[PDB]
Design a protein around this nucleic acid. Structure first.
Lengths: 132, 132
DNA sequence: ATGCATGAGGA
DNA sequence: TCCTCATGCAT
DNA sequence: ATGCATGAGGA
DNA sequence: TCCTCATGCAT
């Protein structure tokens, strides 16, 4: 094993956030600098997820090398109802990956558009793969 | 959470390795291409650790964004004795972070240079923070 | 694929 | 000094 | 900081 | 179609 393991990534995240704050940069500032200085800008959202390890170990591993260059050098949409959420969570608990059919049922059952439900389960499986 | 969570990073790693092999590139080839095309070369070791998630979630998160640019576009040293290792592991089990004093003891006790032992525990704590 | 090491940054 | 974190030479 | 979404790539 | 994975707009 050559790449950073989980404990090391947690330390890098710690260090990165300290340096950013020490230097007076916002998460947004860093994301913008990454595009200006290294050719790949990142959003405030991604910088926030990285610093909190709210990403999978696979994604954190891709990003760490990129953010490390910065560190060295610096030196219509629909909103889901509260009750529908809980039920959705309950379902996720039963089956993490419902089929197109299971899903269609669950949609009508909750009276929600199919695509919205398909996406909710996709987002939920992704969140479950996050470190934090 | 915006960055990739653990499950998503595992999927990206899977995908990345499949594409690399499908395209006929070695891990070394990719590491070299990253320097030629994106300005930050990586070693075969890092590409191997990334593909196996033998890095922390923090480090995987840094690397994923960088390797993602590639993926899109492609489309004197001392050797430790076997018995000393086991004992060292036993020790690690008792105390993960021994002090300079604890360490010095353990060194003489095993008749090994101090620095070598300090480094072994540092490497061991790092390995423990890895996803895999 | 991985053991032993280095080096930057902060401790 | 000495840790953490990222990374890699040598094997 | 995070809910809901998109889009690339493969399934 | 439809998943996984990376990423972000809008809130």
């Amino acid at each position: 094993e050559e790449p950073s393991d989980l404990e090391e990534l947690e330390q890098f995240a710690k260090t990165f956030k300290q340096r950013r704050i020490k230097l007076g940069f916002t998460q947004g500032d860093v994301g913008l600098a990454m595009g200006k200085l290294y050719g790949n800008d990142f959003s405030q959202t991604t910088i926030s997820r990285f610093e909190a390890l709210n990403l999978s170990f696979k994604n954190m591993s891709k990003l760490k090398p990129l953010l490390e260059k910065w560190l060295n050098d610096a030196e219509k949409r629909t909103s889901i109802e509260t009750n529908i959420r809980v039920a959705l969570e309950k379902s996720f608990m039963e089956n993490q990956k419902p089929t197109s059919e299971d899903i269609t049922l669950i949609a009508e059952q909750l009276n929600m558009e199919k695509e919205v439900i398909r996406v909710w389960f996709s987002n939920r499986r992704q969140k479950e793969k996050r470190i934090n």
